Ligand code: SF4
Ligand code: SF4
C-alpha cells in the first residue's frame with residue numbers, strides 16, 4: 001500500500017459515529033476520487049477498504065512500518081476509564097493502538113470534535129472517561145493538529161493536508177491547536193443576520209413573524225458569538241449552513257460544548 | 268480440502284462501527300456464530316437530567332452514516348410527549364429530507380461497501396472496452412461507448428502499476444479467488460460505476476442540505492415543526508427538484524441494471540443468509556399520530572407467514588442483557604429501561620457484546636429493506652409489487668428466492684427505486700399546498716412537568732424508536748432501540764440466536780484465509796455498530 005510518489009495516510013477510528021469520515025466523502029474540487037487516486041495514498045480506512053480481519057491488520061502493520069513514513073488522521077475520542085476496556089479493535093484497547101501508532105507518525109491530525117476535545121461521549125458523566133488525543137497521549141509527546149467541528153467542514157481537512165504536503169510543517173495554531181486560517185473568526189462576525197443583532201432585532205420564537213423575516217436567533221440560543229469556525233463563508237455542500245436554514249448555532253467546534261453550551265435554546 | 272475449526276474477523280470492514288465476527292466452521296460450512304460489538308459510548312447515561320429539547324442534538328451523534336434519522340426520531344419522540352400536531356408543511360419537508368437520505372444511503376452501500384465482495388477490480392484491466400460498452404448499452408437506456416470505458420481502464424492501470432493499491436491492498440480477490448465469478452467486461456462496467464457513484468453521491472447528499480442545513484448532521488428540526496423558512500421559496504424547491512431528478516436517473520439507469528447483472532451472475536447466493544421473522548415501523552406519514560397513514564405501513568411476520576401479517580404492539584418490545592456486558596439478566600421494556608455497564612470479557616460469564624438483545628414477543632426480528640419490501644408487497648402496495656415482480660422477472664426467480672443474502676440485496680435496490688419515484692409525488696403535493704396559501708412550518712407547544720412519549724422512524728436499516736420519560740420537566744430516562752440492535756445484537760436469555768448469527772449458519776467458505784462469503788451476508792444487512800450500541 002505504501003511506496004514512493006503518493007504520500008501515505010493512515011486513518012484510525014476510535015470512539016466515533018463516522019460522521020467525520022462521511023464528511024470527507026463529500027470533498028468537492030477536488031473530489032474524493034481525485035484525492036484517493038491522484039493526490040494521496042489511503043493505506044488504511046476501515047470504512048472503505050477491501051481487506052478485513054487479519055488482512056486488514058496486516059495492511060496497517062505494513063503501512064506504519066513503511067520506510068517512507070506516513071501521516072495519520074484520527075477520528076473519535078479515546079476511552080480511558082477501566083484501562084481503555086470500553087473500546088477495543090482486533091482485541092486491543094484503542095488506548096494501546098493509539099499509543100503504539102501515533103508517536104511514529106510524521107504528523108497527526110485529530111479530525112472532529114471527538115478526537116480533538118473528547119466530544120459527545122466525554123460529556124458528563126463520561127462513563128468511559130473518553131478524552132481527545134492530546135489529552136490521552138500528552139505523556140508520549142503526541143501533539144496533534146486539531147480541526148474541530150461536528151463534523152468539521154471537509155474543506156478544512158483538505159486545506160491542512162495540502163498545506164502540510166507542500167511545507168513539511170504546520171500552518172499556525174491557536175490556544176487549542178487549531179489552524180488560525182480556518183478557526184480565526186467567530187461565526188457570529190461572518191453571519192448574514194449580524195445587522196439584526198446590532199439593532200436588537202431578535203426573533204422570540206421560530207414560528208414568529210420575525211423568524212420568518214430572518215431576524216437574529218440569539219434569544220433562541222445561538223452560540224455563534226462564542227464559537228470559532230468558517231461555516232458562513234464556506235457553507236456546507238456548496239449550498240447551505242445552520243442559521244441560513246433558520247436554526248441557531250450550537251457551538252459544535254468548541255471544547256466542552258455539550259456541557260458548556262447547554263441548554264442550546266437558552267442564552 | 269474442507270476446513271474445520273474457528274475463523275475470526277476483527278475488524279469487519281466496509282461497515283459503520285466496530286464489529287467482531289467469530290464463527291465455528293465444520294467441513295466448509297459455518298456451524299456457529301457470534302457478533303461482538305466492541306465499543307460502548309453510553310449516550311443514554313449521558314442524556315439523563317438534561318433538557319428534553321437537547322436530546323435530538325445528542326442522539327444525532329449516535330451516527331453519521333444514517334445521519335438524519337436519529338434527530339428525526341428524537342424530535343418525533345418529544346413532539347409526541349408534548350402532544351403537538353405539527354403543520355403539514357413541516358411533515359412534508361421532514362419526509363422529503365428523509366427520502367433523500369434513503370437514496371444517498373442505499374447508493375453508497377451497494378457500490379462502496381457491498382460491491383467489492385462480488386467485483387474484482389484487477390480483472391477489469393484485461394477487459395475489452397468495445398465489447399464491454401456493448402454489453403453496457405444493452406442493459407440500460409444510457410448508452411456507453413468504448414472510449415468512455417477505455418478512459419476508466421487507463422486510470423486504473425496507472426494506479427495499479429504504482430505499487431500503491433491503497434484501499435485495495437490485501438483484497439481477497441488479488442491473485443484470484445474461487446468465489447469471484449464476474450468476467451472481465453462486467454468487472455470493468457461495475458468499477459466504472461463504482462467511480463461514478465463517488466461523484467454522484469455528493470449530488471444526492473447536497474439534496475439534504477437544500478432544506479436541511481448540511482450533511483452529515485443536519486440542523487433544521489425542532490419540537491413543533493421545522494426552522495427553514497427558505498424551503499418555501501421557488502428557488503430552493505427548484506434546486507432540490509434538479510438534484511433529485513439527477514439522483515433518480517442514476518438509480519433507474521445505473522444502479523438497478525448493475526444489481527440485476529451482478530445478481531444473475533451470483534444466483535447461487537439465493538441459498539444463504541435467510542431469516543424467519545420480520546418487523547417494520549412504516550414511514551412517510553400524512554398523520555404524525557397514525558402509523559397506518561404511512562406510505563409504507565407497520566407490520567410483523569413470524570416464521571415467514573406473510574398471509575398472517577400481525578399488527579405492531581409497542582408494548583411487546585423488550586431488551587435483554589443476559590449475554591451482553593450489562594449488570595444482570597433482566598429484560599426491560601424501553602420505558603422502564605436501564606443501561607448499567609459491567610464488562611466481563613469475551614465470553615466471560617457467557618457475555619460477548621455491548622449490544623442489548625431486543626426481542627418482540629420473545630423472538631428475534633430482522634428489520635430493514637427486506638422487511639419493509641416483503642411486508643408492503645404482501646399488503647398489496649401497488650408500486651412495491653409493480654417493481655419487485657419486474658425484478659423477479661428479469662432474474663427468473665420465484666418469490667421464495669427473497670429470503671437470502673441475494674434477496675436482501677435486491678430488496679434494498681427495489682426500495683430505492685420506489686422511494687425515488689415517491690419523492691416526486693411528495694414534492695408535487697408539497698408544491699400544491701404551498702400554492703394554496705399555507706406558509707406555516709412551526710407550531711406552538713408547552714413543556715409538561717411529567718410525560719412519557721415515543722417516536723418511530725423506519726430508517727434505511729429498519730425500525731428505529733426513541734423513548735422518553737419526562738419527570739419534573741427534565742429527562743428522567745431516555746432509551747434508544749435501533750435497527751442494528753435488532754439484527755446484529757446478541758442472543759437473549761432464552762438463547763435464541765439473533766438474525767445475523769442465524770443467517771451465518773451454513774454459509775459455505777472456500778478459503779479460511781479469505782472468508783469473503785461471511786462478508787457477503789454480514790454486509791447484506793448493512794450493519795451500523797455505533798447505532799446499535801450508542
Ligand atoms: S465529532 Fe461528531 S460527526 Fe465527528 S465522529 Fe464525533 S460525533 Fe461524529
Ligand atoms: S447571534 Fe447568531 S444568528 Fe445572530 S448575528 Fe450572531 S451568529 Fe447570526
Ligand code: F3S
Pocket residue numbers: 149150187227228229231241242243248249250251252253
Ligand atoms: S453549529 Fe457547528 S457547523 Fe458551524 S454553524 Fe455552528 S460551528
Ligand SMILES: [Mg+2]
Pocket residue numbers: 311746747748749800801
Ligand atoms: Mg438502547
